[PDB]
Amino acid sequence: GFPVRPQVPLRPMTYKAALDISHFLKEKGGLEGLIWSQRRQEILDLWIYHTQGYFPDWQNYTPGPGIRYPLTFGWCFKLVPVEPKEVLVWRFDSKLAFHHMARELHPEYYK
Amino acid sequence: FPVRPQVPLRPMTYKAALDISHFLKEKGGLEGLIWSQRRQEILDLWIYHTQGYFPDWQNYTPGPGIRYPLTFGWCFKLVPVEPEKVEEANEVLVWRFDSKLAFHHMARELHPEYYK
Amino acid sequence: DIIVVALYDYEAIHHEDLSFQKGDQMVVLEESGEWWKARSLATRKEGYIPSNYVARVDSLETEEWFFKGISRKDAERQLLAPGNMLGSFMIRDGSYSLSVRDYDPRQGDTVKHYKIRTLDNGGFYISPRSTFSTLQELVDHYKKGNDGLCQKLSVPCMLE
Amino acid sequence: DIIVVALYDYEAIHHEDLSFQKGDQMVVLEESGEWWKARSLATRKEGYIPSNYVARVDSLETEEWFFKGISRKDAERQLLAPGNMLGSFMIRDSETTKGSYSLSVRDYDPRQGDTVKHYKIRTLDNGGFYISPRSTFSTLQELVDHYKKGNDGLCQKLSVPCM
C-alpha cells in the first residue's frame, strides 16, 4: 500500500536466486511469451533491482542469430526468434536449470 | 556505476500522463503487450521509481470489453486481443495506445459517478 | 529478543526470504549484513528480510526531532527558551505540526507553526510544492534550505 | 550562479523535464521544492530535474575521491584495476542508509599479494567522523587529508583517488 516499498539492500546474483526468479516469472501473467525489447528488459531489471536488490547486470544472453541462451546459470529464460534484426520472445525452459547452454556454446565467456 | 535512485515525489497530471503515454507507445514499449496485474504493477513501480508519480493513477473502467483509463491524459486503453494475421471471410486484453484519448475523457462519459 | 516491525510490505521471491506486511512484528535471528534473518511472530515463518524495511519496536517515536503530545503553547515556550538557535524545531502531533524558531530584527524571537498534511496516498506535505513519503524525509528536506518556511531547520529544540 | 553536477543519468519523459548524464553540469534556475528548474551548460536546454540527482560543484559528493553509491565488491574491482597504485582509495556511501560511509584502500603484502581493505567510517554524536576514536574530524575531507599524511593504523597511507 503506502508508502511505496523502497529500494532494498544490494545482494549478489546467485544460481539459487536466478532459479527462484525464473520460476516466479514463468507463471501466468509474467514474462513467458512476451516479445523482447531493450526497454522491456530494462524495466524488468529495474523492478528486480528495486524490490529484490540484484544489480541489473545478470540478464545477458548469447549473441545471435538463433536462440539466445542466458549467460547466468540458473536463469531459465531464453530468447527465441519468431521465424517470419530478429524478433525475439522470452521462453522459459526448465532444462536450463541443469544445462548451462551458454557456457557450452561460448566457453570463452567464462575464463 | 550505481543505478539511478528514487526521484522526488510529484503528483500525476494530465500533462505527465500524456507524455508518458507517447513515450511508451513507441515499438518495444507498452503497445500491444498483454495485460496482467503483475505487468501493470511492474510498470507502475518503474514509473514511480524513475519519474516520481505515486502508483495509484493507472486505473481502468470495469469490464467487460474495452477498459478506458480513468486518468485523463493517459492514452492507453485495454482492448480485447486480436490476431496479427487477419482471418479471411468464410478475457484477454492488450494495452492499446489511442491518441484520441488525449481529448476525449471516455471513462467519465461512461462512469460520471467516479468523478466529483 | 529484538523485536522489529515492518514499515512496508515485502514479497519474498527467493525461497529463503520472508514475506511480510506493514505492521507485522518479527524477531531478529541473525543480523549480519543488510539482509537479516527473522521470524514472524504471528506465523513463526523464518527467512531473510531487507533490514531497511523494519524498525525496532522500542525505537518507535524516539526520533530526536519528535516531541510527543505537547501543545502549541508549550512548543512555543520551549523553543523560545535561551539556548535554542535560529531554526530550532519540533515535530509534534496521524496529524502532525512543525514548529520553527524564527527571528526578525523588529519583532525579535518568535515561533512559526506549520501544519503537516497528508494526501490520500499517505504522502506528507506542508506546501503543494513538495511531498514526502516519511516525516524524516520532510525534516531532511527543510534542513537543506527554507524552501518557503520562515527559516531553514537547524537542530531539534533543546530538552529541559 | 549555482552550478551543480549530475551524480547519475536521468532520462526525461515529461517535455518540461531535462535529461542529463553523469557528469553534466547545470545551472540551477529555480530551487523550489525537490524538482528544480535547471539549464544544461553544454546544450543550454532547460527543464526540471530531480534535485537528489545533483550536487553543488566543489561539494562532498563531487570530490574526486568520493564514489557515490559504489558497493564493496565494485570498489575492490575498480581499485585492483590497472592504473591504480598502493594506497589508492575511495570513500563510498550506500543507497540504503544515509550518512553511512566506507573507506576502501589498495594494499599489498607477500601473503595475499594485491588486496583491497575496507574500513567503516563512523559518525559521532556531534556529527564528527572517525575510523578510530583517537582521530576524529569535522568533515570527510579532513579525514582524507589526515590519512594521506600517515597510515595511522590503516593498512596503507592514502595516496590518490581510484581511477
Swiss-Prot record, chain A:
Residues 42-58 are annotated as: Mediates dimerization, Nef-PTE1 interaction. Residues 3-12 are annotated as: SH3-binding. Signal peptide: none annotated. It comes from the Viruses. A motif (PxxP) lies at residues 6-9. This is C-terminal core protein. It comes from Human immunodeficiency virus type 1 group M subtype B (isolate ARV2/SF2) (HIV-1).
UniProtKB/Swiss-Prot annotation, chain C:
The modification Phosphothreonine is found at T118. Signal peptide: none annotated. Induction: Up-regulated during myeloid cell differentiation. The highest levels are detected in fully differentiated phagocytes. Up-regulated by IL2. Phosphorylated on several tyrosine residues. Autophosphorylated. Becomes rapidly phosphorylated upon activation of the immunoglobulin receptors FCGR1A and FCGR2A. Phosphorylation by the BCR-ABL fusion protein mediates activation of HCK. Ubiquitinated by CBL, leading to its degradation via the proteasome. Detected in monocytes and neutrophils (at protein level). Expressed predominantly in cells of the myeloid and B-lymphoid lineages. Highly expressed in granulocytes. Detected in tonsil. Residues 1-59 form the SH3 domain. It is found in: Cytoplasmic vesicle, Secretory vesicle; Cytoplasm, Cytosol. Residues 65-157 form the SH2 domain. The modification Phosphotyrosine is found at Y125. It is linked to Aberrant activation of HCK by HIV-1 protein Nef enhances HIV-1 replication and contributes to HIV-1 pathogenicity. Interacts (via SH2 domain) with FLT3 (tyrosine phosphorylated). Interacts with VAV1, WAS and RAPGEF1. This interaction stimulates its tyrosine-kinase activity. Interacts with ARRB1 and ARRB2. Interacts with ADAM15. Interacts with FASLG. Interacts with CBL. Interacts with FCGR1A; the interaction may be indirect. Interacts with IL6ST. Interacts (via SH3 domain) with ELMO1. Interacts (via SH3 domain) with TP73. Interacts with YAP1. Interacts with ABL1 and ITGB1, and thereby recruits ABL1 to activated ITGB1. Interacts (via SH3 domain) with WDCP. The SH3 domain mediates binding to HIV-1 Nef. Belongs to the protein kinase superfamily. Tyr protein kinase family. SRC subfamily. Non-receptor tyrosine-protein kinase found in hematopoietic cells that transmits signals from cell surface receptors and plays an important role in the regulation of innate immune responses, including neutrophil, monocyte, macrophage and mast cell functions, phagocytosis, cell survival and proliferation, cell adhesion and migration. Acts downstream of receptors that bind the Fc region of immunoglobulins, such as FCGR1A and FCGR2A, but also CSF3R, PLAUR, the receptors for IFNG, IL2, IL6 and IL8, and integrins, such as ITGB1 and ITGB2. This is Tyrosine-protein kinase HCK. The chain holds residues 80 to 242 of 526 of the full protein.
